[PDB]
Amino acid sequence: SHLDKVQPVIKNSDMSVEMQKEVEEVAKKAIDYCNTDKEIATFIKDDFRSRYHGTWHCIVGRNFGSFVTFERSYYIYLYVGQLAILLFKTG
Amino acid sequence: HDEEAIKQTLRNKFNYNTRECQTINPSIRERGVSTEPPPSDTICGNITQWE
Numbered sequence: 001s002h003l004d005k006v007q008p009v010i011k012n013s014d015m016s017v018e019m020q021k022e023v024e025e026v027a028k029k030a031i032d033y034c035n036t037d038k039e040i041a042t043f044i045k046d047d048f049r050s051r052y053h054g055t056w057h058c059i060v061g062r063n064f065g066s067f068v069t070f071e072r073s074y075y076i077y078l079y080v081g082q083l084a085i086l087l088f089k090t091g
Numbered sequence: 092h093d094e095e096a097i098k099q100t101l102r103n104k105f106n107y108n109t110r111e112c113q114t115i116n117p118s119i120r121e122r123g124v125s126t127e128p129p130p131s132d133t134i135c136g137n138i139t140q141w142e
Contacts, residue, residue, distance in 0.1 A: 038137045045133075055131075061138070 008080035015076045
């Protein structure tokens with residue numbers, strides 16, 4: 001019932017709805033699978049890189065400010081608990 | 092003298108001068124050039140208040 005409890009919410013989303021739904025499942029799976037936050041960032045980048053070819057930069061922290069140059073429609077912003085799963089593919 | 096001979100006779104070395112002229116042309120060459128951007132590496136950084 002932990003998956004129901006997390007209720008991850010995407011504050012800002014710039015991606016197709018079908019792709020966005022897939023990201024939520026990966027984000028929930030990554031948090032339980034990874035013992036530490038640093039492991040979560042590596043797991044999200046590896047899964048997305050395998051799923052979609054390109055260069056992916058992912059940063060997750062309790063408090064942070066980010067300005068980035070990402071390919072249009074490849075940036076999805078979702079916040080679960082105190083962790084921000086942010087991925088932006090840059091060509 | 093025949094008319095044909097006179098026509099040949101009319102042409103003279105001083106009368107007609109032939110010069111051969113050619114334009115210098117660089118030799119064609121085939122070369123292959125490959126460019127590949129600087130190697131990029133993945134870096135992971137975790138920052139905490141205590142660190």
